[PDB]
PDB file of C-alpha atoms and ligand atoms in Angstrom:
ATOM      1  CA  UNK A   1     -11.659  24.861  -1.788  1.00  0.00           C
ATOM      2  CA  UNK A   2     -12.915  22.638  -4.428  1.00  0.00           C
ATOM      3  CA  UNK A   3     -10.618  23.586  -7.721  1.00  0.00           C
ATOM      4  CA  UNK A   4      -7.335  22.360  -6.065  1.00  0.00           C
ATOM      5  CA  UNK A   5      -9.229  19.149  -6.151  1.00  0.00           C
ATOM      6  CA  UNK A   6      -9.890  18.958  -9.334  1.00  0.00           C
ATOM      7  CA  UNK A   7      -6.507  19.880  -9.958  1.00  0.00           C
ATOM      8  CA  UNK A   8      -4.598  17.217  -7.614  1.00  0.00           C
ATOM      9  CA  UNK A   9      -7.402  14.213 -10.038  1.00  0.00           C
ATOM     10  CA  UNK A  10      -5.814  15.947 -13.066  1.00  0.00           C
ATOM     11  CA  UNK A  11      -2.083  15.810 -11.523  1.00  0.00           C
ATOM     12  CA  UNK A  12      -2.540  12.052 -10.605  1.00  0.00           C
ATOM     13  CA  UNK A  13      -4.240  11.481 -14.043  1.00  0.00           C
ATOM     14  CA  UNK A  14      -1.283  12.362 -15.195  1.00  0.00           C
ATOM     15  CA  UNK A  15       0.755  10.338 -12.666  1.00  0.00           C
ATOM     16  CA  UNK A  16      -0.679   7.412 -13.994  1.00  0.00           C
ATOM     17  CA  UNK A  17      -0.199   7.767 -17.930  1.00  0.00           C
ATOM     18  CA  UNK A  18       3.493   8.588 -16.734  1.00  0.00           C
ATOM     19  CA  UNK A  19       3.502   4.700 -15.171  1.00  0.00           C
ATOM     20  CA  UNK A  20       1.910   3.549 -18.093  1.00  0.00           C
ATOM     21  CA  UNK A  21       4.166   5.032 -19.978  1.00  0.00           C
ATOM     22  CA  UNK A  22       7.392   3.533 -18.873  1.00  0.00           C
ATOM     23  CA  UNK A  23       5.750  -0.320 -18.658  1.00  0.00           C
ATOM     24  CA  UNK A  24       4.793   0.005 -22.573  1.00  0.00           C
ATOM     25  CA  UNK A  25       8.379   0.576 -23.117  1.00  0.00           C
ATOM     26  CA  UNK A  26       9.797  -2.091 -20.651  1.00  0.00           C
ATOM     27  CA  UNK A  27       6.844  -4.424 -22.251  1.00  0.00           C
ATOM     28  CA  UNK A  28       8.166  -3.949 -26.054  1.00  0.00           C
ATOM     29  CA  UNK A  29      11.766  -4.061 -24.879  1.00  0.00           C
ATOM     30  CA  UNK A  30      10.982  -7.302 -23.355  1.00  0.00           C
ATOM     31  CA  UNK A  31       9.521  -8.777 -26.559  1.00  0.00           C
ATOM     32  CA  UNK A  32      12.956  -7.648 -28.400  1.00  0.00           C
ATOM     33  CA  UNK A  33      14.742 -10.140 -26.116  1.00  0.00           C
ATOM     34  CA  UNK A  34      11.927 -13.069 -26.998  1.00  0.00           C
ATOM     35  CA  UNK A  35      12.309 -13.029 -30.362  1.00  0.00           C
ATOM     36  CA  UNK A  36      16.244 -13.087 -29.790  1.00  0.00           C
ATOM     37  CA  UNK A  37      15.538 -16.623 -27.149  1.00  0.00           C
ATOM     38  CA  UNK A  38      13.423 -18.081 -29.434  1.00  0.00           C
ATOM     39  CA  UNK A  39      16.020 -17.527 -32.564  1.00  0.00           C
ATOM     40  CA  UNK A  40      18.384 -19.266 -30.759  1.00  0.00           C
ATOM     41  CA  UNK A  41      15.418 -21.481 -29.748  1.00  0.00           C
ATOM     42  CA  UNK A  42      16.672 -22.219 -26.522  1.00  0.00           C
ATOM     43  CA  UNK A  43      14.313 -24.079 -24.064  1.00  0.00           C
ATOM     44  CA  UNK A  44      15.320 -22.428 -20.175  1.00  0.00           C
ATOM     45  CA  UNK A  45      15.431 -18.900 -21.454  1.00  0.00           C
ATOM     46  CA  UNK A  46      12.354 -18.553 -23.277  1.00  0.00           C
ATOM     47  CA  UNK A  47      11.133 -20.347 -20.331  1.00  0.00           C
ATOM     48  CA  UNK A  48      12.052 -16.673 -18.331  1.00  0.00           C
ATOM     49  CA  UNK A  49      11.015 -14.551 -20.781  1.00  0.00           C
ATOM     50  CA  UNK A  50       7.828 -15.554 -21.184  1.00  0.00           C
ATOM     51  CA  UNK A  51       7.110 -15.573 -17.077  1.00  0.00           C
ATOM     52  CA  UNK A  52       9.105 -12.015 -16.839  1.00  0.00           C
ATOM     53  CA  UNK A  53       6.385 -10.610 -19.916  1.00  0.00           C
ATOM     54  CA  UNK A  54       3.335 -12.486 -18.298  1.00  0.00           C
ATOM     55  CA  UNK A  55       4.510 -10.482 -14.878  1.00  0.00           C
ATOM     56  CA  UNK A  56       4.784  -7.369 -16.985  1.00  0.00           C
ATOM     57  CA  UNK A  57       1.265  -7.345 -18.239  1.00  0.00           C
ATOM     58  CA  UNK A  58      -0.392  -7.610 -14.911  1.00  0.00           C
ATOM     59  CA  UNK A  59       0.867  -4.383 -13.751  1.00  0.00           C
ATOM     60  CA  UNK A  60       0.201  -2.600 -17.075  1.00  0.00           C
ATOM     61  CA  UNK A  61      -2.859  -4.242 -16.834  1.00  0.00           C
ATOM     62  CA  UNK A  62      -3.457  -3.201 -13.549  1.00  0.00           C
ATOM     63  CA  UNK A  63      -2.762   0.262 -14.011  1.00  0.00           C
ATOM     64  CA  UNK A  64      -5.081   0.851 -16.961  1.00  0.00           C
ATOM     65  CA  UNK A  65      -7.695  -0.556 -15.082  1.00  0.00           C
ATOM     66  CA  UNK A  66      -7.078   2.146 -12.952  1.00  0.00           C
ATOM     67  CA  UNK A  67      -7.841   5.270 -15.740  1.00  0.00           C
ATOM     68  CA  UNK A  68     -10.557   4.469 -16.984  1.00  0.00           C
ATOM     69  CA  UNK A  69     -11.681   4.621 -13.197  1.00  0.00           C
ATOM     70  CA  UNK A  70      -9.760   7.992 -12.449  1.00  0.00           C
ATOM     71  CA  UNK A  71     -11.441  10.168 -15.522  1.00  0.00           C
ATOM     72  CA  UNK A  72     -14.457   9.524 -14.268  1.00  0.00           C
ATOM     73  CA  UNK A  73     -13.261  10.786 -10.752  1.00  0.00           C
ATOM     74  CA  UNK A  74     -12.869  13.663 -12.441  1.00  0.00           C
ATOM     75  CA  UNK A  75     -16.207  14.004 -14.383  1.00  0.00           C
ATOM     76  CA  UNK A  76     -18.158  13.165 -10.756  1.00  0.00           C
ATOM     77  CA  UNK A  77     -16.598  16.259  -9.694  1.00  0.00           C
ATOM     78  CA  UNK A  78     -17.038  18.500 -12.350  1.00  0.00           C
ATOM     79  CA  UNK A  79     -20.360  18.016 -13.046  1.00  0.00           C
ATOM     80  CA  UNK A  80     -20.934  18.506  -9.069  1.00  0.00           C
ATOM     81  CA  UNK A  81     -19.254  21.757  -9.564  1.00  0.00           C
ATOM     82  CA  UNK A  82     -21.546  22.706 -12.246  1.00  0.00           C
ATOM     83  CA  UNK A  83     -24.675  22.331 -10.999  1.00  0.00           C
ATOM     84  CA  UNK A  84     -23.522  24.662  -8.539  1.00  0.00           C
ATOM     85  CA  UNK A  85     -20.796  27.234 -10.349  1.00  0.00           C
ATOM     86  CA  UNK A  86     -21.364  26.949 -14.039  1.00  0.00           C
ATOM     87  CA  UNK A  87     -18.155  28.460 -15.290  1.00  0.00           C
ATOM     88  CA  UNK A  88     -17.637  28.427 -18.835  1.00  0.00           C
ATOM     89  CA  UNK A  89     -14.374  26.295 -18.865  1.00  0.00           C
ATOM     90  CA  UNK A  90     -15.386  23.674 -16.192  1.00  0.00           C
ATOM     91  CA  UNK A  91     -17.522  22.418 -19.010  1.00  0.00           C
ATOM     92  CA  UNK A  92     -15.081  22.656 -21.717  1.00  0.00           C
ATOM     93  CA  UNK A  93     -13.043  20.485 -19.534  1.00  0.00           C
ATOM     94  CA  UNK A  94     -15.548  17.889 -18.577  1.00  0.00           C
ATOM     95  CA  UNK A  95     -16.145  17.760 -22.716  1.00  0.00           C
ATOM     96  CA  UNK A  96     -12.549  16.276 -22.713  1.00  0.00           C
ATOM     97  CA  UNK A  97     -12.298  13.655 -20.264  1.00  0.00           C
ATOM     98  CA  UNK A  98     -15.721  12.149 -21.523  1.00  0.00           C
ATOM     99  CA  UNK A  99     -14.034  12.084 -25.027  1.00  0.00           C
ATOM    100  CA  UNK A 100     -10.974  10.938 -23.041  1.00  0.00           C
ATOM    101  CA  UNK A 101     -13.033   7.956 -21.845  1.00  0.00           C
ATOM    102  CA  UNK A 102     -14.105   7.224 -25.393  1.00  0.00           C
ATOM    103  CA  UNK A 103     -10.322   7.100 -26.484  1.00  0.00           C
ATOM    104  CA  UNK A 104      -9.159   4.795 -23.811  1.00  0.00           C
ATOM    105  CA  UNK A 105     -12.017   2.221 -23.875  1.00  0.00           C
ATOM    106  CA  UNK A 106     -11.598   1.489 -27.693  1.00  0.00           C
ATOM    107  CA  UNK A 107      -8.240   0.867 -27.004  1.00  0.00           C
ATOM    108  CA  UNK A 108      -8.982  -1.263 -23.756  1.00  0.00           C
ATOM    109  CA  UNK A 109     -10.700  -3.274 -26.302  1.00  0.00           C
ATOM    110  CA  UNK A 110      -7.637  -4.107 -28.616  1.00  0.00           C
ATOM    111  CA  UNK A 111      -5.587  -4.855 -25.115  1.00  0.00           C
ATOM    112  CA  UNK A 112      -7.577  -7.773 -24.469  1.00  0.00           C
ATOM    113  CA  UNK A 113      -7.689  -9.262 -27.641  1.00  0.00           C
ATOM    114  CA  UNK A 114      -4.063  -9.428 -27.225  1.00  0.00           C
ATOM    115  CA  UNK A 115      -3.423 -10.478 -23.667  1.00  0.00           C
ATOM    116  CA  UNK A 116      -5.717 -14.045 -25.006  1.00  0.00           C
ATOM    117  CA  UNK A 117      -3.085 -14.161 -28.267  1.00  0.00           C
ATOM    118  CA  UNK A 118      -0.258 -14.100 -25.799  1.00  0.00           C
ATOM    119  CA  UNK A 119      -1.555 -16.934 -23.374  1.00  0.00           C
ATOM    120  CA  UNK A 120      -2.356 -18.871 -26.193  1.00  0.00           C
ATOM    121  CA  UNK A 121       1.646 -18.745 -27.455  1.00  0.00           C
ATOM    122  CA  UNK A 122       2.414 -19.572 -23.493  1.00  0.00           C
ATOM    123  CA  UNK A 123      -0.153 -22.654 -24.034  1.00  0.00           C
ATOM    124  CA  UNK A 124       1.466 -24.141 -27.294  1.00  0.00           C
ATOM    125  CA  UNK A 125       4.774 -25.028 -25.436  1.00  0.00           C
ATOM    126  CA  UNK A 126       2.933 -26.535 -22.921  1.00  0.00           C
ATOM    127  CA  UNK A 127       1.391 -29.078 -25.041  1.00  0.00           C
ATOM    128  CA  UNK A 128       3.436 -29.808 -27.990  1.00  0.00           C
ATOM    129  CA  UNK A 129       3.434 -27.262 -30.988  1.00  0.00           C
ATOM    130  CA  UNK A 130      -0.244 -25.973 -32.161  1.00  0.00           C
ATOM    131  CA  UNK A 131       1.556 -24.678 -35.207  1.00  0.00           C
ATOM    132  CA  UNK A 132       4.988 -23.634 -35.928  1.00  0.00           C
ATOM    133  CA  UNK A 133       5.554 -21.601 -33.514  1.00  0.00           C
ATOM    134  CA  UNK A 134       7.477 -18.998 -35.758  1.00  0.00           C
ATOM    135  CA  UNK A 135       3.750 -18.211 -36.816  1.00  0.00           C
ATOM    136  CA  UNK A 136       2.436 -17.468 -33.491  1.00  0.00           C
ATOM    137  CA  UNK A 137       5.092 -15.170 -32.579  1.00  0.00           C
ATOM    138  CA  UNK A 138       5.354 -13.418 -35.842  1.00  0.00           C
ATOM    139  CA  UNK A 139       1.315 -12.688 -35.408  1.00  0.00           C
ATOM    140  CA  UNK A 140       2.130 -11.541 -31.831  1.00  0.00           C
ATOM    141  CA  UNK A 141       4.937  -9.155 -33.397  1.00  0.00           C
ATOM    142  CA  UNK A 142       2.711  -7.413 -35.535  1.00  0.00           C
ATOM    143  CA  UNK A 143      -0.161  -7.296 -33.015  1.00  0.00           C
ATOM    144  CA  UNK A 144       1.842  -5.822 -30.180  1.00  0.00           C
ATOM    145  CA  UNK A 145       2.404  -2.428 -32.694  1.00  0.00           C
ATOM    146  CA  UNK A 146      -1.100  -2.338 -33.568  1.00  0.00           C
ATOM    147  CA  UNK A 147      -1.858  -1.849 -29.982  1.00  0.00           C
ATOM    148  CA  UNK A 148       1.760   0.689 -29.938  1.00  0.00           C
ATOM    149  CA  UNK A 149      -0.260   2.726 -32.638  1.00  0.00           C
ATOM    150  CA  UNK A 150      -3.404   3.247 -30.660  1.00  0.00           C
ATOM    151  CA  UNK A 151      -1.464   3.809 -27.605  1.00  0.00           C
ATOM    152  CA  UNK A 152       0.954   6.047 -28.562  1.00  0.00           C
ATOM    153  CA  UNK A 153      -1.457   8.852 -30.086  1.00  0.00           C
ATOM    154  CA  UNK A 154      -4.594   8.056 -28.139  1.00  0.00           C
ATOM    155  CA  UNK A 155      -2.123   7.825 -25.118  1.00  0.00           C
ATOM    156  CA  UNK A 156      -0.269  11.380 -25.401  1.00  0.00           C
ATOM    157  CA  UNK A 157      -3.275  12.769 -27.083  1.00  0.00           C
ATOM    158  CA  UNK A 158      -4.764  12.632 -23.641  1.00  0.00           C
ATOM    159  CA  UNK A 159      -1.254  13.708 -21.857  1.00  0.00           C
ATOM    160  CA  UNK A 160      -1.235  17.338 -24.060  1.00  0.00           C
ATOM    161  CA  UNK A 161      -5.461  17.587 -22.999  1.00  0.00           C
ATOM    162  CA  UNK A 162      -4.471  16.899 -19.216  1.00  0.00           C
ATOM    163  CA  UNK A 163      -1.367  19.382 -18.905  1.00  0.00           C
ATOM    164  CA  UNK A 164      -4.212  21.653 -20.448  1.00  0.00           C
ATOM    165  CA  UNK A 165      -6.735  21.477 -17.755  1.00  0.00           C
ATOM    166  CA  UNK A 166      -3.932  21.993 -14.928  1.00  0.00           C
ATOM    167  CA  UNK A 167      -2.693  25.005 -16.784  1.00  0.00           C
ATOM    168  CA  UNK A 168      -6.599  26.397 -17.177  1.00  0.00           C
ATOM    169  CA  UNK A 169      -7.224  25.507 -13.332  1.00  0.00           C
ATOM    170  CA  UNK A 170      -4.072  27.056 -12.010  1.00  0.00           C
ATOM    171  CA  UNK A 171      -5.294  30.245 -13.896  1.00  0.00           C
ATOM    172  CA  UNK A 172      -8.741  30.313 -12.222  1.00  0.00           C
ATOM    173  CA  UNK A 173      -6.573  29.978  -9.048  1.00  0.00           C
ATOM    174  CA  UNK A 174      -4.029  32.748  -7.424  1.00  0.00           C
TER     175      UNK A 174
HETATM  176 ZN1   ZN B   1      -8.667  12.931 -19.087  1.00  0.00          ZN
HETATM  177 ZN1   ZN B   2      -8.521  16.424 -17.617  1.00  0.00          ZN
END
């Protein structure tokens, strides 16, 4: 009854990093056509841009609000199942998503950092120009692949672990 549970949390896990996934591209893609708007420095565009990225971070945003929520899902049921079972490889798996929950809140960290940087460089055309603006953006730049680095590996790192713990489950089952 209960390991096609576990498996459907490790499925939907997966579900998610797949979303995230596809808004960290659309995210850095975005920030390609900023630096083009503000090259040409005109004022509508960037205008856009900068609502159409805002927009873009809320539902990235949302969504990894949403993991760090969802691995523990997971733990709550496999340390149920172990008080009960104790198989071997339910705790190797629970092992993982704890570790899994170390990975992602480090680099939940470095997301917020950023997300202030970002409304800060929304705030300077408000009210006048804080610096040149070149400098903002060119920090943002640079700061947006910092976070690409963690994400990437700590990101997929967790995809290969996942696929794992279906593949292990599916065995236990027929
Ligand atoms: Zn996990
Ligand atoms: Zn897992």
């Amino acid at each position: 009854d209960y390991l096609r549970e576990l498996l459907k949390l490790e499925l939907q896990a997966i579900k998610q990093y797949e979303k995230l996934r596809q808004t960290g591209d659309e995210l850095v893609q975005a920030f390609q056509r900023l630096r083009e708007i503000f090259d040409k420095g005109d004022d509508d565009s960037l205008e856009q841009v900068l609502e159409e990225i805002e927009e873009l971070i809320q539902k990235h945003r949302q969504l990894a609000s949403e993991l760090p929520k969802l691995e523990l899902q997971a733990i709550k049921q496999y340390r149920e199942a172990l008080e009960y079972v104790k198989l071997p490889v339910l705790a190797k798996i629970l092992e993982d998503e704890e570790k899994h929950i170390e990975w992602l809140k480090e680099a939940a960290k470095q997301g917020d950092q950023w997300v202030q940087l970002f409304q800060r460089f929304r705030e300077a055309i408000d009210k006048g120009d804080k610096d040149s603006l070149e400098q903002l953006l060119e920090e943002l730049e640079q700061a947006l692949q910092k976070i690409r680095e963690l994400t990437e590996k700590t990101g997929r790192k967790i995809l290969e672990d996942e696929e794992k713990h279906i593949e292990w489950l599916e065995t236990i089952l027929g």
